[PDB]
Short mmCIF file of N, CA, C and O and ligand atoms in Angstrom, two decimals:
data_model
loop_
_atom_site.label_atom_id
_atom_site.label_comp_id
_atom_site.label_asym_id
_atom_site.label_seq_id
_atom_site.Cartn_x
_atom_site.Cartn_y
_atom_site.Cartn_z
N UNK A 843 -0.83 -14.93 7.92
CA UNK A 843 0.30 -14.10 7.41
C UNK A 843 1.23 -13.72 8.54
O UNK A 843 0.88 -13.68 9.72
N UNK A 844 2.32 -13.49 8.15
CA UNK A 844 3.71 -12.82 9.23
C UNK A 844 4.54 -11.64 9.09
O UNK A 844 5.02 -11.46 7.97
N UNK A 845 4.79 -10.89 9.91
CA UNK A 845 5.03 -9.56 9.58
C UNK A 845 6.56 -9.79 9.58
O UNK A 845 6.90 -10.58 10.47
N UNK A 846 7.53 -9.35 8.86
CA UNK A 846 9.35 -9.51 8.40
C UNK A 846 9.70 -8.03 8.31
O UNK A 846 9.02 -7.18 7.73
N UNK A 847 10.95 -7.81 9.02
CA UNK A 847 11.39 -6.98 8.96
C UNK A 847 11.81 -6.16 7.45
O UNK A 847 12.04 -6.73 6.38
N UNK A 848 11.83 -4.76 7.68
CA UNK A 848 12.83 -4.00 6.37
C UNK A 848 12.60 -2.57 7.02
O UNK A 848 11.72 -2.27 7.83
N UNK A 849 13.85 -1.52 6.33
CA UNK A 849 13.78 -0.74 6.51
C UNK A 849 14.26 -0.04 5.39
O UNK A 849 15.10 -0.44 4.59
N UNK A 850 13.50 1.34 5.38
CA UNK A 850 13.39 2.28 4.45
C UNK A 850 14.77 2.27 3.59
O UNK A 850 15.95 2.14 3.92
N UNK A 851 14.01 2.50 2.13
CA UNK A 851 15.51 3.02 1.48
C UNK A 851 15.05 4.68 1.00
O UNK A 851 15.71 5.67 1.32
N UNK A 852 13.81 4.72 0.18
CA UNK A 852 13.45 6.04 -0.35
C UNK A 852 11.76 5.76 -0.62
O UNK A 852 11.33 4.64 -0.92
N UNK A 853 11.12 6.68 -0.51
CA UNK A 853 9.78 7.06 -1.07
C UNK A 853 9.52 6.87 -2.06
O UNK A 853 10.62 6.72 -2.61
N UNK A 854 8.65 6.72 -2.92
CA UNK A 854 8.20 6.65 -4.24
C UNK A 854 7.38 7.20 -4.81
O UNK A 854 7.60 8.05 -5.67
N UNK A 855 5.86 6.68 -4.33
CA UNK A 855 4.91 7.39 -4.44
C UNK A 855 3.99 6.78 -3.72
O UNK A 855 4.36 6.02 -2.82
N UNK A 856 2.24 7.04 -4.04
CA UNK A 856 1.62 6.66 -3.39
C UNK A 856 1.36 5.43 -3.05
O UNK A 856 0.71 5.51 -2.00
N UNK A 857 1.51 4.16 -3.38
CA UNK A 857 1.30 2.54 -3.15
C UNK A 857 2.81 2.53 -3.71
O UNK A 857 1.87 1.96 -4.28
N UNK A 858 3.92 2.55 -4.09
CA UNK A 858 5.34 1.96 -4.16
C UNK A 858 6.22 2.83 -3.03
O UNK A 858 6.09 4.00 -2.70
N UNK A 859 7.25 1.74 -2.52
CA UNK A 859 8.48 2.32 -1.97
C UNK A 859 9.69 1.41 -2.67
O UNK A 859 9.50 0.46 -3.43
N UNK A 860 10.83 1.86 -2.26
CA UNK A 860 11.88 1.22 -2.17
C UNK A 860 12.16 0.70 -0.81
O UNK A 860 12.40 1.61 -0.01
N UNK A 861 12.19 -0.40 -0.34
CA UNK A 861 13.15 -0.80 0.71
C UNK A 861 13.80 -1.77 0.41
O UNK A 861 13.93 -2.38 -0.64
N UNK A 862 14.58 -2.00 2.27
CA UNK A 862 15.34 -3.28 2.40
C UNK A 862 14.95 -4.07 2.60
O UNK A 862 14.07 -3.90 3.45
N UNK A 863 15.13 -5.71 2.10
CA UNK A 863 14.18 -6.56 2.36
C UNK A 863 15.05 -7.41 2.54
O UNK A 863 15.49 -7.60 1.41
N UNK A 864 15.92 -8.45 3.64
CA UNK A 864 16.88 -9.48 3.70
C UNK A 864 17.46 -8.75 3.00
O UNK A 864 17.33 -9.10 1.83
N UNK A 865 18.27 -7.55 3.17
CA UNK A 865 19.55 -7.18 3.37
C UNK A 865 19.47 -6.84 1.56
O UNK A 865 20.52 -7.24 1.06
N UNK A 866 18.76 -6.37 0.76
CA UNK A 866 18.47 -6.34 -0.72
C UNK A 866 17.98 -5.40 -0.95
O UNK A 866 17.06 -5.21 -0.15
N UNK A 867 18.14 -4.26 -2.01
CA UNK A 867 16.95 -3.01 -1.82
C UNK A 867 16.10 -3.78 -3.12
O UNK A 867 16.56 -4.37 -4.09
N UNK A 868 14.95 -3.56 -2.80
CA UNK A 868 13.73 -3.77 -3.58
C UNK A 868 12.52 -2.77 -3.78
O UNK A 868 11.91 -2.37 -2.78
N UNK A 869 12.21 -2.40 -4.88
CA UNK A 869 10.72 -1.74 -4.81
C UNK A 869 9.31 -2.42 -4.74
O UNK A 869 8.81 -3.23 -5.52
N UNK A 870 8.74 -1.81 -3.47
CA UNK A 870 7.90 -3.08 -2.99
C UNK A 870 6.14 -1.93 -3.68
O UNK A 870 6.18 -0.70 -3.62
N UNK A 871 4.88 -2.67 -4.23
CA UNK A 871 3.70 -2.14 -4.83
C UNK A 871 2.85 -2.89 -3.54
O UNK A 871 2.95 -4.07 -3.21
N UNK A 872 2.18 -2.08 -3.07
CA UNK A 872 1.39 -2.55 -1.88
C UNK A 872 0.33 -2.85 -2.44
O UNK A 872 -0.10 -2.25 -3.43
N UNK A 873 -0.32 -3.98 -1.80
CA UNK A 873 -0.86 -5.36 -2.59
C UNK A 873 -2.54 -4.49 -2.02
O UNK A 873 -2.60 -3.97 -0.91
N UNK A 874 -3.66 -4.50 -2.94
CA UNK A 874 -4.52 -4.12 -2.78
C UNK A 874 -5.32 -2.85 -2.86
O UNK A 874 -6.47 -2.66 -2.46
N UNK A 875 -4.51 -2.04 -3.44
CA UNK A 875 -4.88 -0.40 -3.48
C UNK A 875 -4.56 0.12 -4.77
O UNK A 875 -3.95 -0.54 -5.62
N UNK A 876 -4.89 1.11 -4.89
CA UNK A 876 -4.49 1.90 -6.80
C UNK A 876 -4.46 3.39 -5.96
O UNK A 876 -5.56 3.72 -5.51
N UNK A 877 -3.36 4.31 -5.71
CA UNK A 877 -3.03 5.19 -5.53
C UNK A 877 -3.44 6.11 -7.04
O UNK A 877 -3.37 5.69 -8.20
N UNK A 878 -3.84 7.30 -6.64
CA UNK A 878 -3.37 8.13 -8.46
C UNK A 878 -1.79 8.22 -8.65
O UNK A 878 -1.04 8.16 -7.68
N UNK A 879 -1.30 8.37 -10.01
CA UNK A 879 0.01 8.98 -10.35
C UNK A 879 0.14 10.18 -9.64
O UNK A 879 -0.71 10.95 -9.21
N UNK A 880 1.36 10.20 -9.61
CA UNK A 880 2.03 12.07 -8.80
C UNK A 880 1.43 12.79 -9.92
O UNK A 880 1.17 13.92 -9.51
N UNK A 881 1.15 12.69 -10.97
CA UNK A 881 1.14 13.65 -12.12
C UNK A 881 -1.00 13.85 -12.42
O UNK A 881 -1.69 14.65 -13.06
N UNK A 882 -1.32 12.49 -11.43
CA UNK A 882 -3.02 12.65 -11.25
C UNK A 882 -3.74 12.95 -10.04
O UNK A 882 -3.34 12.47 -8.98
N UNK A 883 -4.82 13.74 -10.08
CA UNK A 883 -5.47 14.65 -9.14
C UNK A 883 -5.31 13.61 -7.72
O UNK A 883 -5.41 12.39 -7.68
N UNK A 884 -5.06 14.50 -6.68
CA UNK A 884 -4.66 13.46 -5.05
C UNK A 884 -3.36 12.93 -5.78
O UNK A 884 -2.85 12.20 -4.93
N UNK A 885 -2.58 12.91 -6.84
CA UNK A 885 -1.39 11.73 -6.81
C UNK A 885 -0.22 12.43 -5.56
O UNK A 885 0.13 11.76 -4.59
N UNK A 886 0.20 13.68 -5.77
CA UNK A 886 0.87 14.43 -4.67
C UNK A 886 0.40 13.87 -3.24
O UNK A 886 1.12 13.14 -2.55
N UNK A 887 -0.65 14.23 -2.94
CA UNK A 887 -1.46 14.15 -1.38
C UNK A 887 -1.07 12.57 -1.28
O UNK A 887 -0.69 12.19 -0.17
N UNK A 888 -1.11 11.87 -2.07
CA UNK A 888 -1.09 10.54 -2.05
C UNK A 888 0.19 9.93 -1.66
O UNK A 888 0.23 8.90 -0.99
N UNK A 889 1.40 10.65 -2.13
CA UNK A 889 2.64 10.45 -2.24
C UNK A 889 3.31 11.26 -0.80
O UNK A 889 4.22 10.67 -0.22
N UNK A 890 2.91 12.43 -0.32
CA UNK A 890 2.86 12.76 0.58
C UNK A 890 2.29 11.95 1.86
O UNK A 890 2.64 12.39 2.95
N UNK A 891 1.74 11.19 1.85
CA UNK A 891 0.99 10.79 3.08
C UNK A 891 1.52 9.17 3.36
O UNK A 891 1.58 8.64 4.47
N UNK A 892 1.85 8.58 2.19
CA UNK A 892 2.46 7.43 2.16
C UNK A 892 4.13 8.06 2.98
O UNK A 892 4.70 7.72 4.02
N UNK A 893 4.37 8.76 2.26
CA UNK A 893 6.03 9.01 2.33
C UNK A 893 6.74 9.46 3.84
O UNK A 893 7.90 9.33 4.25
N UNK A 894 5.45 10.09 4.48
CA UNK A 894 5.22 10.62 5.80
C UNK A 894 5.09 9.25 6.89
O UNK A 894 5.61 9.30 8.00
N UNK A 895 4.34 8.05 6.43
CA UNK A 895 4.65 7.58 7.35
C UNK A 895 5.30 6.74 7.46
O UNK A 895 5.22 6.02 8.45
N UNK A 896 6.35 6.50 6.31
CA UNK A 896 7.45 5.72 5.72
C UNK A 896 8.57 6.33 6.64
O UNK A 896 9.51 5.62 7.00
N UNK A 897 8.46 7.45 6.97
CA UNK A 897 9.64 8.05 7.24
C UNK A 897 9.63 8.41 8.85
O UNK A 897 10.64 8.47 9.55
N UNK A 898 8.36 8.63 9.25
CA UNK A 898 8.13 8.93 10.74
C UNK A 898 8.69 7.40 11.45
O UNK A 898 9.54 7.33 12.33
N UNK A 899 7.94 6.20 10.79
CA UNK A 899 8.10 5.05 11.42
C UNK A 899 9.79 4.85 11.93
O UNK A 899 10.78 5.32 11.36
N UNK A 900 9.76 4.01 13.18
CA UNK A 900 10.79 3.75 14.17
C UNK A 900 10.75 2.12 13.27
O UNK A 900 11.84 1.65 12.93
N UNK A 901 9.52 1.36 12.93
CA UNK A 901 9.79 0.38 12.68
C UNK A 901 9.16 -0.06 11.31
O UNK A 901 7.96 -0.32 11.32
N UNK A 902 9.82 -0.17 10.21
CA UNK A 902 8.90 -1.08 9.14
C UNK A 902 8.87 -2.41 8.56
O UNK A 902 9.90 -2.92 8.13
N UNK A 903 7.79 -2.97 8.52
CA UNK A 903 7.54 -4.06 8.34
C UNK A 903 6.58 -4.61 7.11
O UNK A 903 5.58 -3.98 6.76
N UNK A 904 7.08 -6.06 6.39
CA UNK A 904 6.57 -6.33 5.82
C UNK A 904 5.55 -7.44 5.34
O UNK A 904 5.91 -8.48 5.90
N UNK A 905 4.51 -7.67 4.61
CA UNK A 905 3.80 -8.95 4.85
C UNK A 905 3.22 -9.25 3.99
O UNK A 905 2.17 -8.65 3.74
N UNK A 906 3.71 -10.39 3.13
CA UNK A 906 3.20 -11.05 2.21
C UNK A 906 2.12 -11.49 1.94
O UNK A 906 1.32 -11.05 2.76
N UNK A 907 1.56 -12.24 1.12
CA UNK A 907 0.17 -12.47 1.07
C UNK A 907 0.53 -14.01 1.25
O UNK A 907 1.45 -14.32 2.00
N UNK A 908 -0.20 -15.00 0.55
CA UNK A 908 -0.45 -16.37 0.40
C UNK A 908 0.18 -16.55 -0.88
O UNK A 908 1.12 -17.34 -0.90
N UNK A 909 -0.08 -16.06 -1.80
CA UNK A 909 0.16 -15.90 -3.37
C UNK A 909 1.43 -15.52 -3.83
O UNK A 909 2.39 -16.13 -3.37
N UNK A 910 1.65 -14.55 -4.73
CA UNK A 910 2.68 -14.07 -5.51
C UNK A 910 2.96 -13.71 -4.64
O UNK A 910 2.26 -13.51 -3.65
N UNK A 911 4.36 -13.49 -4.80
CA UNK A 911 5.01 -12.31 -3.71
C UNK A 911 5.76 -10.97 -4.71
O UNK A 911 5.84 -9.80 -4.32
N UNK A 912 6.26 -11.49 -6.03
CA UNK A 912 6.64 -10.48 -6.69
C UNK A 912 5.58 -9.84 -8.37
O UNK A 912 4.52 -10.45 -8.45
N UNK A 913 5.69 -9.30 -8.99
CA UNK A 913 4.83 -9.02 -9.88
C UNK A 913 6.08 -9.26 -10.94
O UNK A 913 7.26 -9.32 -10.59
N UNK A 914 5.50 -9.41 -12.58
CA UNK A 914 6.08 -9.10 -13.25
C UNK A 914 6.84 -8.10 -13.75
O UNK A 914 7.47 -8.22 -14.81
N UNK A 915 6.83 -7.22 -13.13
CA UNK A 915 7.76 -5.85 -12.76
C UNK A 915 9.04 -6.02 -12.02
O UNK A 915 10.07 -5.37 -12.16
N UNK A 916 8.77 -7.21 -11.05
CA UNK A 916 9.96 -7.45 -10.38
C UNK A 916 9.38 -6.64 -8.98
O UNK A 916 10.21 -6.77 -8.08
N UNK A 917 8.43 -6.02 -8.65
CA UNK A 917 8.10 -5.11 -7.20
C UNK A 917 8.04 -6.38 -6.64
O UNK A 917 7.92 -7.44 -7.25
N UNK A 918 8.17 -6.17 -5.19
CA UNK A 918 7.25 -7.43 -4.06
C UNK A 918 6.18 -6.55 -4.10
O UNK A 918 6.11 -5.39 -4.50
N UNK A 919 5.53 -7.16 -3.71
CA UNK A 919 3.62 -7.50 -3.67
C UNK A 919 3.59 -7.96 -1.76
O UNK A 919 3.76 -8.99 -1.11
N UNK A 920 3.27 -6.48 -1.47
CA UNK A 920 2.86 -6.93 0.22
C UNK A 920 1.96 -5.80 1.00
O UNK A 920 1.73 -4.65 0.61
N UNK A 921 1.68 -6.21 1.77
CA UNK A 921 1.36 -5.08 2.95
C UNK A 921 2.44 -4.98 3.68
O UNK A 921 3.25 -5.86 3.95
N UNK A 922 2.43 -3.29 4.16
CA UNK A 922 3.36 -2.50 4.11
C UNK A 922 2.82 -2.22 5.80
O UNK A 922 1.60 -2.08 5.98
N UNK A 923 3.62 -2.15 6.82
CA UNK A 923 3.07 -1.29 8.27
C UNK A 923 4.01 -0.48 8.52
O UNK A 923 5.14 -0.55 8.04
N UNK A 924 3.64 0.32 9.25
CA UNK A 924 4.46 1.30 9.85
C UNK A 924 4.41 1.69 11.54
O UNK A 924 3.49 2.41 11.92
N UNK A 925 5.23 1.30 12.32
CA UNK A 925 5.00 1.43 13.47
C UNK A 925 3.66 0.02 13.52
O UNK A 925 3.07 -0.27 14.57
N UNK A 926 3.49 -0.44 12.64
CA UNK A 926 2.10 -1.48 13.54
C UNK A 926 0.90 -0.96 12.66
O UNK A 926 -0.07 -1.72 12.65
N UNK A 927 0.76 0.26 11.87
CA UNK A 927 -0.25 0.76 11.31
C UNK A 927 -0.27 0.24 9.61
O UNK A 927 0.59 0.64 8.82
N UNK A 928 -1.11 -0.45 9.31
CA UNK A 928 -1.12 -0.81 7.78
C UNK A 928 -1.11 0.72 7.02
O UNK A 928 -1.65 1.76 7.40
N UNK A 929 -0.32 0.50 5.84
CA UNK A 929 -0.29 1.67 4.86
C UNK A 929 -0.91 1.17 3.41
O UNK A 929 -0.66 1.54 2.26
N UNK A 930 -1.66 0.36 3.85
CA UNK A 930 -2.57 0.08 2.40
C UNK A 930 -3.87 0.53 3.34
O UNK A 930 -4.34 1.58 2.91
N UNK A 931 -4.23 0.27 3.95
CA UNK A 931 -5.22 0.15 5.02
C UNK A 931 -5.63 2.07 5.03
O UNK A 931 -6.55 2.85 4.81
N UNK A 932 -4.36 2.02 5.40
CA UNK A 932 -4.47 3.87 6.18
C UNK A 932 -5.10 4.79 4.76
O UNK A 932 -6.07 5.54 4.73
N UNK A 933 -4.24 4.43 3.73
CA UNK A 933 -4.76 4.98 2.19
C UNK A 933 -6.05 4.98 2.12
O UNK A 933 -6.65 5.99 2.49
N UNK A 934 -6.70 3.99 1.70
CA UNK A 934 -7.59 3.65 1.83
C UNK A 934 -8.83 4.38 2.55
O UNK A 934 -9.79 4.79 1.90
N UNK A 935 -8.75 4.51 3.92
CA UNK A 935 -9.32 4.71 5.08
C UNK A 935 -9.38 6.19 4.63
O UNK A 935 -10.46 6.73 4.83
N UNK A 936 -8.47 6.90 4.08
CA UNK A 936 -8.55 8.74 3.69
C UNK A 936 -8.81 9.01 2.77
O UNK A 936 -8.71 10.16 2.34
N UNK A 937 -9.30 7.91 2.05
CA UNK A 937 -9.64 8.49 0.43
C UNK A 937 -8.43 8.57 -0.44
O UNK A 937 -8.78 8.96 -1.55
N UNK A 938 -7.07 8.35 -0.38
CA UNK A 938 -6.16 8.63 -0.86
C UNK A 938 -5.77 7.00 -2.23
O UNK A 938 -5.00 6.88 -3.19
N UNK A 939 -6.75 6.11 -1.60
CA UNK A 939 -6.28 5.04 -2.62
C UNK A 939 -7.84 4.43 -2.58
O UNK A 939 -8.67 4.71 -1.72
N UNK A 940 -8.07 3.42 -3.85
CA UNK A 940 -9.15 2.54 -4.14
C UNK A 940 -8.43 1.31 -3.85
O UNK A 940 -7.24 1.05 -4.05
N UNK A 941 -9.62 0.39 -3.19
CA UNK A 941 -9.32 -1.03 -3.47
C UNK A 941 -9.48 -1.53 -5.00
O UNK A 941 -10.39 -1.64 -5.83
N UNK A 942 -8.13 -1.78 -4.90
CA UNK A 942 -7.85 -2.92 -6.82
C UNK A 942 -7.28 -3.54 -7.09
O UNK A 942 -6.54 -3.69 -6.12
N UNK A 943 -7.00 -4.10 -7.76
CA UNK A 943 -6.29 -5.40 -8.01
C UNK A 943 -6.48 -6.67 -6.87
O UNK A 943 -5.77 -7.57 -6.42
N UNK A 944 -7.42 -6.35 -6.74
CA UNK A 944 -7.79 -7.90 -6.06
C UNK A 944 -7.72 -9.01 -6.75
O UNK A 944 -8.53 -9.27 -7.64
N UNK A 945 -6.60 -9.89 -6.35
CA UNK A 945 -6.37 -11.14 -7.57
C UNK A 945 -6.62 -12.86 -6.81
O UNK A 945 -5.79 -13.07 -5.92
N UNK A 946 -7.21 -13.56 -6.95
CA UNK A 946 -7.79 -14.37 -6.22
C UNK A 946 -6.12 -14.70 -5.58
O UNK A 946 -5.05 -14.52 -6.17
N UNK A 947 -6.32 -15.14 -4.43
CA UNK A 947 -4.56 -16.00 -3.34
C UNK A 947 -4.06 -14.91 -2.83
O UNK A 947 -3.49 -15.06 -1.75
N UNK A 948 -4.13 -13.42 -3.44
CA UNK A 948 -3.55 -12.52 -2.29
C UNK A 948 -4.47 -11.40 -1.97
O UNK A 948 -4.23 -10.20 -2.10
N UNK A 949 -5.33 -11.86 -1.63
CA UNK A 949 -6.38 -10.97 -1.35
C UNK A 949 -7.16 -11.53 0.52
O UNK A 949 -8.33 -11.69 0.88
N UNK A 950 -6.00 -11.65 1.17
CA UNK A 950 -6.73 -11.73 2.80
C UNK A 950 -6.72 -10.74 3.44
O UNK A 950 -7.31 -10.97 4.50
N UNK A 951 -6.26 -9.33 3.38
CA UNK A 951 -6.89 -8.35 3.80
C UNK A 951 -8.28 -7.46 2.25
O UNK A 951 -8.32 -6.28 1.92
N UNK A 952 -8.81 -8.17 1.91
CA UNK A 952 -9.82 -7.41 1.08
C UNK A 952 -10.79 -6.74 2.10
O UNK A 952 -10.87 -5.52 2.00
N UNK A 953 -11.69 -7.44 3.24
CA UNK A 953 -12.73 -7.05 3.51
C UNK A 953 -12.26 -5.71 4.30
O UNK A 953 -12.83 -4.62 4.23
N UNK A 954 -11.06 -6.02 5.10
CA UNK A 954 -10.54 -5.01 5.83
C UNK A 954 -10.60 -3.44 4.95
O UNK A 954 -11.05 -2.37 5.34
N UNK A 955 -10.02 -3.78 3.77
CA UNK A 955 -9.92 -2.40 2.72
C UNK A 955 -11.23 -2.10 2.72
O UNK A 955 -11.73 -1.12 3.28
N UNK A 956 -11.88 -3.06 2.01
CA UNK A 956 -12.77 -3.01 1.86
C UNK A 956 -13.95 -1.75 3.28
O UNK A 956 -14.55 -0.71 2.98
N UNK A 957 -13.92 -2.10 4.04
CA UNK A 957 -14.67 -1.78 5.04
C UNK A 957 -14.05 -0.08 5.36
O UNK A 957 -14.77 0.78 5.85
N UNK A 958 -12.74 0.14 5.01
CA UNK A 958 -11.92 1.49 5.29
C UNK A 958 -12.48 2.31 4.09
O UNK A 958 -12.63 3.53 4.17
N UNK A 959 -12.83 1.50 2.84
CA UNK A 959 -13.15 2.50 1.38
C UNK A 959 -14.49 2.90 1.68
O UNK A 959 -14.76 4.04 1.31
N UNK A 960 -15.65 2.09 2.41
CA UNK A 960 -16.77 2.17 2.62
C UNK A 960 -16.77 3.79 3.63
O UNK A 960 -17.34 4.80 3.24
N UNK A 961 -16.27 3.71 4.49
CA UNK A 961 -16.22 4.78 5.36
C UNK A 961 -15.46 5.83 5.21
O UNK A 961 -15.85 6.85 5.78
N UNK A 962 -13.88 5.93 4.21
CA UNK A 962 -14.28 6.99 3.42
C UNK A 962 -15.05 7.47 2.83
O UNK A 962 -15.37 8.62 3.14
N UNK A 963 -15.69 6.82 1.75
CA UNK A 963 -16.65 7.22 1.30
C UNK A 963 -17.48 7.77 1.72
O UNK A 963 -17.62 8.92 1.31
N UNK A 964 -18.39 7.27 2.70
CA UNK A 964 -19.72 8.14 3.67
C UNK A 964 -18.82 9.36 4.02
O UNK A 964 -19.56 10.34 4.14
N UNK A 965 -17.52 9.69 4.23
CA UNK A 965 -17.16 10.50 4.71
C UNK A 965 -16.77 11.72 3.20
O UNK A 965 -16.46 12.91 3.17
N UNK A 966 -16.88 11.19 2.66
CA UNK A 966 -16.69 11.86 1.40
C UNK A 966 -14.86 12.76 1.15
O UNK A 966 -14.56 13.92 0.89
N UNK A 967 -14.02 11.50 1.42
CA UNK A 967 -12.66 12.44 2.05
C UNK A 967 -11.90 12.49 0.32
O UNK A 967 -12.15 11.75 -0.63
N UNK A 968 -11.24 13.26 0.39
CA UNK A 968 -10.74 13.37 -0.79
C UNK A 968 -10.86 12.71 -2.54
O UNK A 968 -11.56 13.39 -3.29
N UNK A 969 -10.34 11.69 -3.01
CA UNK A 969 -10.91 10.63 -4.02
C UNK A 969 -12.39 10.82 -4.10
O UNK A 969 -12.92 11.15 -5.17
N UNK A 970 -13.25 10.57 -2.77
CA UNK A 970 -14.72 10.32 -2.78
C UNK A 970 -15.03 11.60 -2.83
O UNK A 970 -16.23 11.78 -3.04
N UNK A 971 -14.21 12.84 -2.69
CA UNK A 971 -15.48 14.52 -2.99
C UNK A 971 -16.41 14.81 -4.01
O UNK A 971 -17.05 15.86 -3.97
C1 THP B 644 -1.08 -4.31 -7.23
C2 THP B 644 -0.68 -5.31 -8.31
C3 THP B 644 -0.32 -4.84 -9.57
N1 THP B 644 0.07 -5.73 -10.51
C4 THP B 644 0.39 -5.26 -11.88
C5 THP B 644 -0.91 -5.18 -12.69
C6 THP B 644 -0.75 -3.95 -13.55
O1 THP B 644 -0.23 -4.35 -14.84
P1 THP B 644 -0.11 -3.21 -15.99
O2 THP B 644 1.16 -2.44 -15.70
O3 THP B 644 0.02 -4.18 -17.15
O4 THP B 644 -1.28 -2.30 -15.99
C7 THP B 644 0.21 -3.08 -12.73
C8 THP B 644 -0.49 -1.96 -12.01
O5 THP B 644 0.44 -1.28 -11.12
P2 THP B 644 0.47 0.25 -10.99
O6 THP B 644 -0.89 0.65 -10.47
O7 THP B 644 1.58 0.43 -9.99
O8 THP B 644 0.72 0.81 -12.40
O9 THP B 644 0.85 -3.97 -11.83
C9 THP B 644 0.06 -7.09 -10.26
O10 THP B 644 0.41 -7.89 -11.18
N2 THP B 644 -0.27 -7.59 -9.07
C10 THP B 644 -0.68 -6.76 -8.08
O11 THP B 644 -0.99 -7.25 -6.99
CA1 CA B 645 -0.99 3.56 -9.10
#
């Protein structure tokens, strides 16, 4: 995979943003995670913590999978970094998102999630209380 430039347009919530993508605003669903709704328990904390480092970042970047790149919604379908730090990854890692939608072709960071949900968990951080 290859990391492509974009930069912020607005927040969304917890796994969606809006950005720029080749000069286009798009709402991008980060490929691998299930955030709650703003309106479901953690959906706030969730939307907060995504949005925080959407906005701190100097640099954002984006990265496709192998597979789809857009959904039938019209979102891109990617991993999301910030400064260099995955934001499917980071979710994950705090309890703030589950690994889901694992769909066979875009699923090459699974084990990675995978291994961040495990250790929330033992840690029992939010989602896992
Ligand atoms: C994350 C992801 C979601 N989707 C679709 C499946 C779900 O369809 P349905 O809307 O029919 O449930 C929806 C879930 O997204 P949200 O969790 O953002 O609602 O987005 C994909 O098609 N590919 C993906 O990689
Ligand atoms: Ca969701």
């Amino acid at each position: 995979l290859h990391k492509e430039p974009a930069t912020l347009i607005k927040a969304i919530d917890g796994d969606t943003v809006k950005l720029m993508y080749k000069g286009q605003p798009m709402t991008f669903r980060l490929l691998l995670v299930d955030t709650p709704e703003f309106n479901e328990k953690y959906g706030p904390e969730a939307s907060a913590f995504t949005k925080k480092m959407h906005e701190n970042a100097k640099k954002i970047e984006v990265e496709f999978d192998k597979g789809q790149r857009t959904d039938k919604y019209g979102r891109g379908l990617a991993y999301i970094y910030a400064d260099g730090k995955m934001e499917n990854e980071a979710l994950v890692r705090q309890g703030l998102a589950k690994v889901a939608y694992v769909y066979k072709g875009n699923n090459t960071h699974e084990q990675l999630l995978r291994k961040a949900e495990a250790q929330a968990k033992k840690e029992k951080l939010n989602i896992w209380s």
